[PDB]
């Protein structure tokens, strides 16, 4: 014979309480790892561009000092 | 009446009872899967959204709802139990 | 936009320690080494045999021989620049 839903009432704040601060970790942890893999991904990524772009230009360079050489 | 509710809540967690059940509770819904399919649906939520727009925030409000329902049942009938208990022994 | 920032610093941080002069000499070696310039000069040989001296210019020349010139240059030396720019940027923050 339960008189109050008083312990009904404490068990469902009690509940949801534990609940949702646990979906707000949860939340934040794997959104920090997403992004701090999506960083690596970027870092890489970044490094191959600027890997191409050096090679372009020292390239271009280089195709002239060529062409000089063979003349005569 | 709230002060009841105020009294009850403030003797749970001095006696510590409320660290216990909290620690029990989340360790319940780790073991059962529940967490998984919490970062299973923030997986989505991301790849559906991107990651230059998808926030925190976001992401709760999007993840909350089916988390609140999916929480078992049982656990809840076990938590109510442990209360009823705690209230016999401290009052 | 903040991949472009990122390729500004990572290329800033290449000039400020000197290490893109490095990575010039390195291309440079790696070029020599798989027989780049000597086939590049083959290919001037010919497009100026074809031209003439007279009728060929530089600005022509560029033209003709920097596709072939691009070409040339294996995957292996390119992979080999990208590692050493991303253990450069691992050892300087």
Known sequence: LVLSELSQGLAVELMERVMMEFVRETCSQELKNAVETDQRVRVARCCEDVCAHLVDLFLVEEIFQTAKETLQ | ?91
Request: proline residues 2%; aromatic residues 2%.
């Open chain 2, 1 to 91: 009446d709230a002060q009841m509710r105020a009294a009850i809540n403030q003797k749970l967690i001095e006696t510590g009872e409320r660290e216990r059940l909290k620690e029990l509770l989340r360790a319940k819904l780790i073991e059962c899967g529940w967490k998984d399919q919490l970062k299973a649906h923030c997986k989505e939520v991301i790849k559906e959204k991107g990651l230059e727009h998808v926030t925190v925030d976001d992401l709760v409000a999007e993840i909350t709802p089916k988390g609140r329902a999916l929480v078992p049942d049982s656990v809840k009938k076990e938590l109510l139990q442990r209360i009823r208990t705690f209230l016999a022994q401290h009052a």
